[PDB]
Ligand binder design. Sequence first.
Ligand code: FMN
Ligand code: FMN
Ligand code: ATP
Ligand code: ATP
Ligand code: FE
Ligand code: FE
Lengths: 484, 484
Amino acid sequence: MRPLDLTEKRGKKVTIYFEGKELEAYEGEKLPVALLANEIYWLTTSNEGRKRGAFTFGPVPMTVNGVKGLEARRIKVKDGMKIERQGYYDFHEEEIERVVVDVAIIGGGPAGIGAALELQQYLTVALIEERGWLGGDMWLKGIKQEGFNKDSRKVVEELVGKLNENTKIYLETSALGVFDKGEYFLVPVVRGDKLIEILAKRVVLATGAIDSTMLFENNDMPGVFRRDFALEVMNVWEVAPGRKVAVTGSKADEVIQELERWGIDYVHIPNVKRVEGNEKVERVIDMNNHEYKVDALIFADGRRPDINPITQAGGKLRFRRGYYSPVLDEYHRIKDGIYVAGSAVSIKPHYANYLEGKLVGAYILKEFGYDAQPCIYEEKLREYEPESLSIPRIPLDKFNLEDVQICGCDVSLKKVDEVIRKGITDLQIIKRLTHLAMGFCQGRYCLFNGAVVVSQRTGKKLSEIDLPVARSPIKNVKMGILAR
Amino acid sequence: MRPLDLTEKRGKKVTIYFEGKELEAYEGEKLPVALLANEIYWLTTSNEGRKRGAFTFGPVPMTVNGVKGLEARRIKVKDGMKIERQGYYDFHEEEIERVVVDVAIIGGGPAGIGAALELQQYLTVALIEERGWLGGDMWLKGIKQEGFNKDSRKVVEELVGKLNENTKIYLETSALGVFDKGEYFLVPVVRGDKLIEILAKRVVLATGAIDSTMLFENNDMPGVFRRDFALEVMNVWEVAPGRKVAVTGSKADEVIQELERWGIDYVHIPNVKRVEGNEKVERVIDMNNHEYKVDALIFADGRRPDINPITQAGGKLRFRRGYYSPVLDEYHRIKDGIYVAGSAVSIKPHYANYLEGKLVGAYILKEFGYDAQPCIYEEKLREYEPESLSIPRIPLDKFNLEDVQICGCDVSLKKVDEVIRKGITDLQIIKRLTHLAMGFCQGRYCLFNGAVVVSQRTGKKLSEIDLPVARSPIKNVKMGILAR
Ligand SMILES: Cc1cc2nc3c(=O)[nH]c(=O)nc-3n(C[C@H](O)[C@H](O)C(O)COP(=O)(O)O)c2cc1C
Ligand SMILES: Cc1cc2nc3c(=O)[nH]c(=O)nc-3n(C[C@H](O)[C@H](O)C(O)COP(=O)(O)O)c2cc1C
Ligand SMILES: Nc1ncnc2c1ncn2[C@@H]1O[C@H](COP(=O)(O)OP(=O)(O)OP(=O)(O)O)[C@@H](O)[C@H]1O
Ligand SMILES: Nc1ncnc2c1ncn2[C@@H]1O[C@H](COP(=O)(O)OP(=O)(O)OP(=O)(O)O)[C@@H](O)[C@H]1O
Ligand SMILES: [Fe+3]
Ligand SMILES: [Fe+3]
């Protein structure tokens, strides 16, 4: 057992080296998780000298066997592996498959599975998921779940269990976007390092929501965990974020329930001002200047639909219930032939998103001439009012602005605030002046916040501040993979 | 075979007497039909001396064995029976059951049966029908029907076939209205001469549409058949309206198809001005003064929802698509707890009205806690656009107004036109001055026409001329039956 193991691992034991030090890991574990288990948090430094971990926004470039600039999260641990830290900008110096399919479902959470289950009654589908497992956010929980009155992870197993050979599953697979060729849609997809082109008649974006990022002082430092990452390490791998854990944000109960299940000690800090520490977090300070000693901070401030795949697919947005949503016709369509389902549509219980996927799959099944009954899913859905999110009042005056990070790359809240103060309110321009939303997330974890700041400094309402649209490759792909 | 028999009848032969004359009839036949078969049309005279039959608006009081004032349509023929004509106002001088039920469905056409079929999965229903058979208007057809791609009367048999013991059927049973007691509804019902009180939690009005009445000169004279009566005698009993038949109105094809099936010769007169003859029709004259020799005229100018049971139940009306309809909430409710289904709601194919009955039954099943799926019926219904009806321009200037009858009782078009000409436009007042809608139909076959006349003479739009509401007993009941 390593110090942060929640279980004794029974996988094949393996040995790796971090900065020369000999560490034990298990086969199949991903680099940052093996290092966490061994109490190692600080994995890289940004170009302007900011220490960083793997469990919040931003990329983790690491030298993995003399090969510079590999992404830590993507790398499985391997016996004899030589791992080292490096600069942010340090790079290394040194057979297309075509598959035709009826629908192409992007995203493998409850919505995606839902759609696939409905669809494979008669059609051939691609279920595309970049994640390596086929649950959704649901596979991150293991707490009993409403709707299917049954344990979160047990439901996923049941559902995956029910998939046909009519469903081609694509794990560890990144969709690069959707391209309408009139007669079909092209969804180019990357798995391992092969490019696969999926030509489909229909598409469904079952694309999910992403966790909102909280603005407080060293919010990027090692040992801060965004909700999803904390749940992943605890529930998927079985590793604690730390020995004693601070928890914050408006959905902190979801996290606390997991902590309690695993018996991980914690404090609940409703309003975080700052985190401090040399390599990692060791104190958090609240808005009343109270300090708490802890090894990690976990924040959970609500999920918001990931709008990138929507807007690259050519969909339009609406602001409602504290977040941006897809504008849909009466059939959950973004545009003719592209359906949207799940937490991509709105925030609501897993079961609801599951139904919406079935709903969306049923419409296309009806399109195809099969006798489906989308409305039974429709009427089940209405039983679930979509959730709201409070819009954050960022106490700008009360923060030391250069310490609070807005995006992954450079980009402090101060830089953004500065340009707004000089009159610029158009996010298009803000994007260019500061590098907000130009980093390796494409604004996923910062655009909305940038908007909130403009809105706050301006008085201009959020339902009027329109968002820069997502462009060509919605996910990072390198570049060799795309020739010839 | 009698002269107007379409088949040789194999029922028990019986013998009756009309005005002394010995006639042959069959057991189970109703008086006016036996007399028609024997070429007898003129059955009574109105108080102001107008000869009348049984196949258009108005009552048929007859002396049936020295008992004056019995209603011809209601009387079954019986061996030795002595039948005579009489004045309109000639009258004779000389154990309540309580049944509690979940729903009480008023009207036994496809809508009613539809509702009952849905409902008896779990609930106990009363299916109430005054008609003696359980089809609807559908049982009047015997032509292949859309929806259930199958012969009209064969579908009825199939459907009735499927009724449980959870459905109490009440044939030859007149509902007197609906009375909300909060904790339940009272639907008093008359069968034979017993009064039955049905106490139900829910009610559905599956009440039907009635055939519109055409305004032309002697439109009340013997040998004029309203669509429904012509179909009844031909298809239910098997007796021809006449040897050679004139057909008119905008739904004349429905009738012509039946005529052709039975091989009954006919002429199609698109625009009738007048019918003439001593005892019966013998000529019809068109708007261009062309004459045709015939034995009967059949008119079919569209059905309109019967609004009486609706308004006595306390529902409100809307004018759309050329006719008055119930105002419904989003659940086909007139008012809490009273559902409306079928051609009572709108004009559309039998199959659609069948679905609407299932729809309505499913909602109440959901109300009761059972898991029903009203929406599958919902979405099937949308496949059927409700039909329109042209609003008639009555050529008032071109008619001899005192010959064209508006209501059953006295009441010529002239009487109505007169009062309108003297400034009165409120139907409330018209009702009182002339006796329009005070006869033994309660305006069923004349209110709308009265409105059309006002509208035509006034310029005032029909969607603004509101209709006198139906009151206490929606159907005639006598009076002894209601003590003690
Ligand atoms: C000189 C220049 C540099 C740019 N650098 C970046 C960049 O570093 N990251 C990025 O995501 N986009 C970059 N862009 C693309 C901008 O997002 C660009 O204004 C754009 O995408 C146009 O807006 P649209 O894509 O919404 O139409 C750059 C564009 C220009 C002209
Ligand atoms: C003197 C008098 C005679 C009436 N005669 C008849 C009648 O012969 N037939 C009929 O249906 N209603 C008759 N009524 C009832 C009218 O329809 C009456 O104005 C009425 O119903 C009130 O309108 P409401 O029922 O719509 O509230 C009569 C009412 C009065 C006062
Ligand atoms: N471009 C992409 N390529 C492949 N997978 C993607 C892409 N974008 C998003 N996804 C995946 O879609 C999945 C979204 O599932 P998620 O569980 O978040 O939402 P859901 O299925 O609507 O239901 P719920 O939000 O309640 O779990 C995530 O697993 C995410 O990795
Ligand atoms: N007060 C009443 N008591 C008993 N029966 C009634 C009463 N009022 C109307 N009805 C009956 O309701 C039935 C209506 O059925 P009808 O077939 O006209 O309409 P439907 O079932 O909606 O479908 P469709 O119009 O297509 O046939 C008729 O048989 C009529 O006699
Ligand atoms: Fe970024
Ligand atoms: Fe009348």
